[PDB]
Design a protein around this ligand. Structure first.
Ligand SMILES: c1n[nH]c(-c2nccs2)n1
Lengths: 412, 412
């Protein structure tokens, strides 16, 4: 019968910091992590900036010998996972290792690695492909490598649901525990899609902000002058735990995961419907899953990608789900500061939603100078808003019309 | 408690055929789908063969224009999904579309599209990259496109657990239905990594059979002369359905999905442990999930990849789980005929396990001329074996030591 699930550990690499507290400090201070990209030449690209992870040292986590075999998205995923597990205080034993699993996902996975091996194949031939090309690039190897290093013998898998990956990964890991398949799950996602194919590929679709001359002002969710999303890199990981197992070991509990919804738009490969019908269905599934009156919702960490269509669809979804209470809750997009971490989006934003509950503060939407037509809710423009938050909701929407919603509340 | 889940439709592209009955007819005849790969200069590669899909006509499913936008792995996934839905006789309506979802996954995803867009990028720069590059290459687009084409608004997601993808997709889809999150799911996996990067990538790890002189003999699970797996392409899809929903509309039910087990080896990135301790825990987990005693298992569709360490671990795992019943059950590897479809392996092998129940026949392990040390189980060498089959297991054990087991039972 269905068990309760709490958050006892979190971990992160973001464009604002190499852990949670440094990332969170940046969020509350309204700081942008967006900057011209330095790790490659982008003069031929329409977009030349993004949220890079700055000064990441993999040797805080892994031997240079193992690190060399792994795409950055895996290094980022393991870093966030290791932080989350350490932060949880949990010790892995023969008694519990079969009951601890991992679900760390990615939207695109090892694109840099596949690109670099593609260049070796084309310039030199197949004999120059790394022997580590497959284990070092494919999306499930965050879950795999993490299980090997820590001895996790529980459910071991990975989701790939584009920009919804992190939310789905956390949601379904919670279901694992809820239904007794595991007592502990490390869940979230990682992304590093800032290579030629990534920036080029989103470039070709005309999906990215081209504001190359003012990168910190590019990501401006619901601003009338927004021109697409800002591509960003990193990882979020949470330790999810059965409540009684957490109480049994005297775990510090950040919050309770009370609600998970999924829906498909069944509308368009890449465009959300203007009315946010699928987002609405998703949030309603989540609230019913949590047993909540929608008026209990205090804070929404929006998907809020800074696209023309996605942003307005979210307002429509929120107004349709919350009616008049849509004017009382606070909604913000931390993507205003971090940019869009794609598959890791839902993972870092679930962490911000939990830290919103711990600290009783709504993070800001920076750059919201001129709210667009119909965008007339509390969008926490410019500056963090201290306020009562009992219930926090985190939304993700992806290519394929794939929707995810997480519902967190304060735990006593 | 928990709802019962049945199989009401199946769909497939394999190296043996362009649908289930043609594929199955090959399986029961012991036919190989393995041949040298065409329209591709493999001169500089140590492997020049695999299981290609032969004669696939995407325009039976899609317009030329929509097919141009999608990697072959996505096309293959949609073919199987379309077959399975049609095979089910399901009618999607406004009254049920929110209760119908998709979980079609892949191990490796759009290598062929990545290869071709790399060519453009390296030759001509980023502005030649296709607008559809990203949505046409990411693993969740089978679920995405299928949900858009059929108006499916239920849970929409995708697994990527390497060679365990298909087994995990079907298992977690069954959970969605059992715990009332959906009445219907389309689940399985697809793969097309017979490109330079797949053959090169796996070739660089020396994972592949290099028996170029005799492609049909390359795949020889548990034979003392096996020298690694054979890379194969295709897709499996199953329509999973809650039992009462199936009975009400008068569906033809192939079999019941009674059990799903997962585990992690926590051993090595690509090598199983010698004793198959992980595959043993996963099978025990699947049998416990099904409330069945190991003694009740009649037929196992092995992982049976034709790798030295993989085959021997599966024998040890079975002997350990099954004790004095281990010789009584029949266990075959259809990979002896199909080769290894990676993330689609588990989907097509689930279908073969369901058809072994319908037809009371264990498919052969072809090329098993000289069983290896300790491979003294009933491995159904050379030819099909008619027998009693009430309960059938399908095992998948992939990179990162991620294990999956499905338990199917005859339905009357
Ligand atoms: C070729 N074989 N099966 C099919 C389709 N079934 C349903 C939609 S298209 N085309």
């Amino acid at each position: 019968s269905r068990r309760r699930v709490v958050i006892t550990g979190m971990g992160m690499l973001s464009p604002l910091g190499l852990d949670v507290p440094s990332s969170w400090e940046g969020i509350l201070a309204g700081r942008s992590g967006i900057a011209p990209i330095e790790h490659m030449d982008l003069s031929a690209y329409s977009t030349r900036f993004g949220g890079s992870v700055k000064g990441f040292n993999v040797e805080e986590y892994l031997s240079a010998k193992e690190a060399r075999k792994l795409d950055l998205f895996i290094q980022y995923g393991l870093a966030a996972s290791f932080q989350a597990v350490r932060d949880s205080g949990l010790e892995v034993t023969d008694a519990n290792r079969e009951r601890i699993g991992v679900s760390m996902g990615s939207g695109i996975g090892g694109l840099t690695n596949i690109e670099n091996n593609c260049r070796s194949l084309f310039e030199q031939g197949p004999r120059r492909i790394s022997p580590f090309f497959v284990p070092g690039s494919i999306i499930n190897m965050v879950s795999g490598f993490l299980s090997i290093h820590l001895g996790l013998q529980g459910p071991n898998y990975a989701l790939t649901t584009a920009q919804t990956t992190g939310t789905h990964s956390i949601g379904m890991a919670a279901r694992n525990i809820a239904y007794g398949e595991a007592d502990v799950m490390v869940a979230g996602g990682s992304e590093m899609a800032a290579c030629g194919l990534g920036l080029g590929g989103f470039g070709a679709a005309r999906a990215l902000s081209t504001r190359n001359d003012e990168p910190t002002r590019a990501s401006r969710p619901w601003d009338r002058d927004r021109d697409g999303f800002v591509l960003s890199d990193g990882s979020g990981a949470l330790v999810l735990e059965e409540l009684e197992h957490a109480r049994a070991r005297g775990a510090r509990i950040y919050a309770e995961l009370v609600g998970f919804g999924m829906s498909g738009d069944a509308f368009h490969m890449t465009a959300p419907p203007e009315d946010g019908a699928g987002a609405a269905r998703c949030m309603k599934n989540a609230l019913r899953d949590a047993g909540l009156d929608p008026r209990q919702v205090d804070y929404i960490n929006a998907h809020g990608t800074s696209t023309p269509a996605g942003d307005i669809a979210e307002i429509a979804a929120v107004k349709s789900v919350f009616g008049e209470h849509a004017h009382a809750l606070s909604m913000s997009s931390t993507k205003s500061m971090t940019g869009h971490l794609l598959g890791a989006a839902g993972a870092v934003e679930a962490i911000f939603s939990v830290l919103a509950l711990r600290d009783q503060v709504a993070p800001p939407t920076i750059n919201l100078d001129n709210p667009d037509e119909g965008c007339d809710l509390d969008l926490v423009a410019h500056e963090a808003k201290p306020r009562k938050i009992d219930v926090a909701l985190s939304n993700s929407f992806g290519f394929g019309g794939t929707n995810g919603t997480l519902v967190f509340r304060r735990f006593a």
